[PDB]
Design a protein around this ligand. Structure first.
Ligand code: NA
Ligand code: NA
Lengths: 64, 64
């Protein structure tokens, strides 16, 4: 398993809208992702990785 | 309660070494903080807020 320690804190870009679940690109890799609070994070938006649920990244939109 | 949504994703600076518990400054406020994985994050280091445990911020050191 690619651990939590490797992913948490990284920035990615939404490639498939998080509504609240979707798809993000982090480094070169595609990942399943879920926004922590927001109902919807749009394609192209920058997100921050804050946790991990199995192979699903939990993200908030990047601040400012 | 100042919710998780307000704090998660923000950057702060360690004001009292996280070993793993300590003190950080986020915005103008002093907060209790705990590093998520690391055994020790030093004074002056930049951290990212990834979660919250009561009034204690859970942080990783800022990437790159
Ligand atoms: Na949600
Ligand atoms: Na620990």
């Amino acid at each position: 398993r690619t651990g939590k320690e490797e992913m948490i804190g990284l920035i990615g870009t939404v490639v498939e809208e998080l509504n609240p679940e979707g798809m993000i690109k982090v480094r070169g890799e595609l990942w399943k992702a879920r926004s922590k609070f927001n109902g919807k994070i749009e394609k192209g938006e920058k997100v921050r990785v804050v946790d991990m649920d199995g192979l699903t990244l939990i993200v908030v939109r990047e601040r400012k």
